[PDB]
Amino acid sequence: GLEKTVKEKLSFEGVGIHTGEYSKLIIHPEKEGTGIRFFKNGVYIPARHEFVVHTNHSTDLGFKGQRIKTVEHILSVLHLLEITNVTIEVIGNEIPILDGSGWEFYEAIRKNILNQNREIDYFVVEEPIIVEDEGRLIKAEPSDTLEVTYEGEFKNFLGRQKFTFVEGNEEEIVLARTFAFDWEIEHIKKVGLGKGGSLKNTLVLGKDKVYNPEGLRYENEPVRHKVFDLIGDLYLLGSPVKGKFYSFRGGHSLNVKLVKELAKKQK
């Protein structure tokens, strides 16, 4: 496939789920071979694993004293549409959460794709690999197409659920919203996070209840969102990824751990 950028500048704005502050994005077109990077207060922060500085409740990047929180969703949408060259200018300290999914980003960027004059240099998983952490596990193996399966084992009514994404089914995961369980809200607030969270941008679940009056968009919306997250974190490898992935209870921390190991193996 050929590298792609956006036809023109695209802007998005809104509160950040963690900072609770208003932030704005301006997605700028870039020439072939530029790659995906963020720009904040005069500093360019490449969308690569070397710049990850936090992964507990979001994937955050930083460089030279400048930090940007929650890049997982915008990066996942860019990965899914195979946008390879753009500069995401951020005026604020975090990417706007919007409705908690990648829908708005997806609809806008998809309508503004510009093919360029260079073959994409994909990151191709060359051999099987497995990373684990406290019962959580993620496996990656060779594949001509990006395939991602996420299996969750939740302590509430969700129980055991599984979802598989395959190329062409992008729309099945870009609408899945971020979620949190009521029993983890106290901790998130205590560590200085989740300041912008609300039922408008977060699916809040209880042991046996869904607080959002609109309910779930899909009975397995939570696992679809986790697949969406992994695809965003996988883009930290530096280019569109070709491989088959299986994540069991994975999260941003384990996702980045996998990315770093795959990168080391210069796979």
Ligand SMILES: CCCCCCCCCCCCCC(=O)O
């Ligand atoms: C009662 C209003 C709801 C408060 C929402 C708390 C903030 C949401 C935390 C974000 C959870 C996603 C964590 C992740 O990125 O893996």
Ligand SMILES: [Zn+2]
């Ligand atoms: Zn090609």
Ligand SMILES: [Zn+2]
């Ligand atoms: Zn924490």
Ligand SMILES: [Zn+2]
């Ligand atoms: Zn996240």
Ligand SMILES: [Zn+2]
């Ligand atoms: Zn997410």
